[PDB]
């Protein structure tokens, strides 16, 4: 049982919204030991769905793994301008991951709530996502 985290700062969230496509991937982060398994984050600005069109979708993708499957629990959260966690989403259940398989939330955060300056979620037009993974 290994636990690690990864912070993803997306620059020019609104400024380069159209250059971001239907989906954009993040850099690959390891187990915190850099030995066997590699993950990355996959976010959908539009949600590519009718029910989640007003939402931003966030996923945890398993890039490479030595074994056949990997069971892991994940937790997504947004870091506000003062570094604090907000709008956290997670499932107490663990999920099976295979090379090229991903798990996440289609409706993770409302775009309206995200772009609202009152929530202080986009300082310097940067969206800072936080992910914590617990491999079993």
């Amino acid at each position: 049982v290994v636990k690690f985290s990864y912070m993803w700062t997306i620059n020019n969230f609104s400024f380069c919204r159209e250059e971001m496509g239907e989906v954009i991937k993040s850099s690959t982060f390891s187990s915190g030991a850099n030995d066997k398994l590699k993950w990355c984050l996959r976010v959908n600005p539009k949600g590519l769905d009718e029910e989640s069109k007003d939402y931003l979708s966030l996923y945890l993708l398993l890039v490479s793994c030595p074994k056949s499957e990997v069971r892991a629990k994940f937790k997504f959260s947004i870091l506000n301008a003062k570094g604090e966690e907000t709008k956290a989403m997670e499932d107490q259940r663990a999920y099976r991951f295979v090379q090229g398989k991903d798990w996440g939330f289609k409706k993770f955060i409302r775009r309206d709530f995200l772009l609202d300056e009152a929530n202080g979620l986009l300082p310097d037009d940067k969206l800072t996502l936080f992910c914590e993974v617990s491999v079993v």
Binding site: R42, Y59, M89, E90, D91, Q92, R93, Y95, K101, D102, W103, G104, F105, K106
Partner: peptide, 7 residues
């Protein structure tokens, strides 16, 4: 936990 999905 109910709320989760994949691609």
């Amino acid at each position: 936990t109910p709320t989760a999905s994949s691609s």
